[PDB]
């Protein structure tokens, strides 16, 4: 199981809705939770482990044997709160890189569960923050897209280092460039 890193094009590719709720989905969900616990995360979207499908696994407590294991298939955020708050965000696709992002404080979410049944939930505080970040992955959106220009200045070099690393690894030109901003 492989964690994808920026600027890998998997992180910007279109993510397909899931229509069949079967054992392939069960097995992928188990593997995604296990990556999530191994990496000390509260949520994990599928493109981050290399699969372009609309799937997130989530434990608001982020601790084994605690909280709830939530699977969100084809999720939609139906409502964002008007109140916006700053927080220093990280991302598994950008190892060691953190910076301030402002997002709504709370959200309301519609999705389908592992058996295909509709449910909805509301999140606030750290869970709403992590949720929005991983949901953005599902739409091919990355956390520096949400950053102000001043915050982006502070990590531009760390990002260019990632772009040069992709070029070294593949021999292909970096598919996107932060200097375009
Ligand atoms: Zn397992
Ligand atoms: Zn597990
Ligand atoms: Zn922890
Ligand atoms: Zn991320
Ligand atoms: Zn430069």
Residue numbers in the entry: 1 to 181
Show sentences the authors wrote:
Here, we explore the precise structural inhibitory mechanism of actinonin, which is a slow, tight-binding inhibitor of peptide deformylase (PDF), a metal cation-dependent enzyme. PDF is the first enzyme in the N-terminal methionine excision pathway, an essential and ubiquitous process that contributes to the diversity of N-terminal amino acids. Actinonin is a natural product with antibiotic activity that inhibits PDF by mimicking the structure of its natural substrates (nascent peptide chains starting with Fo-Met-Aaa, where Fo is a formyl group and Aaa is any amino acid) in their transition state.
The two most interesting variants, G41Q and G41M, could be crystallized under the same conditions as the WT protein. One molecule (chain A) is in the O state and is similar to the structures of the WT and the G41Q variant (zone “O”). Ringer analysis indicates that in the free G41M variant, many residues show evidence for unmodeled alternate conformers—including positions 58, 42, and 130—in keeping with the second hypothesis. A very similar situation—although more balanced between the two states—appears to occur in the case of variant G41M, suggesting that a mechanism involving conformational selection followed by induced fit is a general model for PDF and that AtPDF is a specific case where population shift virtually does not occur as the free enzyme is completely in the O conformation. This structure is similar to that of chain B, one of the two molecules of the asymmetric subunit of variant G41M.
